[PDB]
Symmetry: D2
Subunit: 240 residues, 4 copies
């Protein structure tokens, strides 16, 4: 029965021994749900957020599961210096980086006629520029090693959808899809694949459970998506 919220599946070893860094991972949300999935799949995890108290509580909750290593690094993704320090501390604490999941993003609800420059710029900075910062810091690191890796960006159906009062967030998210495509071509040189998931915001008569989005992230992080780069996977809007 597809209309009933399904139970989160077990791990299947998809990421065993990989170090996975996930942003916007404080408290309930796709970020923490993705960190948990990575742990379920046998990974060591580094979680990051601007919000220090809830990041710490999230780290403790993940550690309690008694799976692999869990580290937390504070990072304001609007700061280049902090995003560069995020990658450096990740490698310091966990020995390497294998997978980056770029979740950080900021929504809103404002028609173009009422749009302020301050909100427009903030949404782009948090939702789109942050992905660039973290991809830049990650690729610099991957260029310097031989084992390569994977990045997974989290876009949104709003990148495709015509939606009243969502022009900021939609433009930032369409921006993320294009950045995913173009950085993927560049990333081949460093042995890195880059793809994105695009969550819907419904065919089953229900919304996705967070775990279902994280499960598709895990696929794009895993060797099951070996040949895919520069792709954007709708979860789930029947994207044509």
């Amino acid at each position: 029965n597809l209309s009933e919220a399904p139970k989160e599946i077990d791990g299947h070893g998809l990421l065993k021994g990989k170090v996975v860094l996930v942003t916007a991972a404080a408290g309930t949300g796709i970020g923490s749900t993705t960190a948990r999935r990575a742990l379920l799949e046998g990974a060591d995890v580094v979680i990051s957020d601007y919000h220090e108290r809830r990041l710490g509580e999230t780290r403790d909750q993940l550690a309690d599961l008694g799976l692999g290593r869990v580290e937390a690094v504070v990072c304001d993704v609007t700061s280049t210096e902090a995003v560069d320090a995020l990658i450096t501390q990740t490698v310091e604490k966990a020995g390497r980086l294998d997978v980056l999941v770029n979740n950080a993003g900021l929504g809103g609800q404002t028609p173009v006629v009422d749009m302020t420059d301050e909100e427009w710029d903030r949404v782009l900075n948090v939702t789109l520029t942050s992905v660039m910062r973290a991809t830049r810091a990650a690729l610099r690191y991957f260029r310097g090693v031989d084992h390569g890796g994977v990045i997974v960006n989290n876009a949104s159906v709003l990148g495709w959808r015509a939606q009243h009062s969502q022009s900021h967030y939609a433009a930032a998210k369409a921006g993320v899809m294009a950045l995913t495509r173009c950085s993927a071509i560049e990333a081949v040189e460093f042995g890195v694949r880059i793809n994105a998931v695009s969550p819907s915001i419904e065919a089953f008569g229900r919304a996705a459970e967070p775990w279902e989005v994280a499960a598709t992230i895990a696929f794009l992080a895993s060797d099951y998506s070996s040949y895919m780069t520069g792709e954007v996977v709708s979860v789930s809007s029947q994207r044509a």
Copy 2:
């Protein structure tokens, strides 16, 4: 790590443990056969189908040699509705149930429109698009009659989207498959069935895809990791925007 090097096929990770997976056009070494192998590596019992009767039996025996799940073979000309209907029934009789269908069967060509023959046009469409409808109808009829659901994976093509000289028949057919995936997916929710497609490219890494890589993505779409997805088409890999 060097992405232009052909990677080694990965081990199974239990993604389809206990499921019955039927794979069409699966005689040989091609994508059908490879996908059947992936299904077995993932813990599935498998039924393979094809019209190459001897080649199929031989493929079945080789897949049986792995000593994993059960392998059954069922002959089917996918241009015959009676044969496709009988494929689903025999699969269900032999293996006990059907959980996942993979629609591989397709037919290529190279002919400009200006000199296209009706015969070639009709055959490409029949093998490539109409077979997928035949197999999907028969499976949804089965699924309708039981309480469990399941999953169908279609195999489309980047040619559905790409403007390509001399491919109008195959491109139209594969674009047809994408649309059929979408519409049948909305209908299939009722029976607890998800329907998606993979879309192979024909190069960012400077190498072609290994058939095993396409099969790995099919396995994803057959598995619970794709739990929320239905009526999607996943490019493997053309950077589809």
Copy 3:
């Protein structure tokens, strides 16, 4: 106000002197609406349809506008022999062909689970294969003359939309989109451009809060037939579903 049905605009000489052939053009429908638009734009027109008596009446109604010349040729588009004769008789009656508009489509509402092959094949034949037949016959004509031309295909939003009980029409129309792309690349060699319009259709929700007037769809067909679309080939123009 955008939610009110707008009045049809005047002609602007976008097709002055061109021979435009339009299929599924008898009676009331996008075909006859497209033929009228062609005439408003200065064209001579050949209209085609299955139903002989209805086609003659539309031919008379159109010639009465007192604009370009209007000819009619009967064609069952499921017949290769008849589509081949449509182009032949078009050139015989009007002297040449400049623009072909492929309108023919057959709708349905049947789930896959209960789909009959009879309906499936019929829908594919009328909606997709006829477009291949007509494009083949046109390109064959263009290969034999010292000029090119333009084809405009009529697809549908259903090519993209996931819709219960429309898998046949949807497959056929997505098929028309891919045919439009591939045939366009080939048609370059003949100096022929090929594009498609993709009209929205109610599922039974629209940006303006109204359906399109047929004239609005024909006006976009006119654009794709005209020199305004000079650089475009192999495109599919949504009218109008905010296609991303």
Copy 4:
């Protein structure tokens, strides 16, 4: 031969009695080429750019056609104050505003690993944020009157294309496409349609074996500004990459 550059076509009266504002329209390039097309089609035009002398020169050249009125207003599109005053000045000098064409854009060639925040932000500001500023200013005007109008953005195939070293420009142009879709929905209220053209560019490549002449891109913009696109809003028209 479609590989031979076609001659710019005559006006056909598609914009009679309209005031058309075009940005980045000084000198050579799509803006000035678009302003010329607006004039050929019977519009009065206001052209805008940052370069005062080059803008004045263009104004005099377009005025020397002896067609519609040409005004010029200097505007730095990275400045909200200047963009707001661009719209005000347009309405003051020309009487009203009917069509805005958002042409400004800025590119680069920089791999992500080498990307500076400053270049990233500059490219997004000029290519994407400027379109928001201009659209916000125009919609404020249209809201305050009981007539509608039309906005046309100019995106790029780069919104869709995976291209080494263009991640900033690509993100910006993909963003323009999404902004076009969402602003189109809101604009219905004010009687305004908003669509975009998306010009192709050679990867190395193009169907015709030639790049588009600027006029051909302007001719499609004219269609999007005209009543021939009556039913379209929130659409992105590829000129011409065979967008599926």
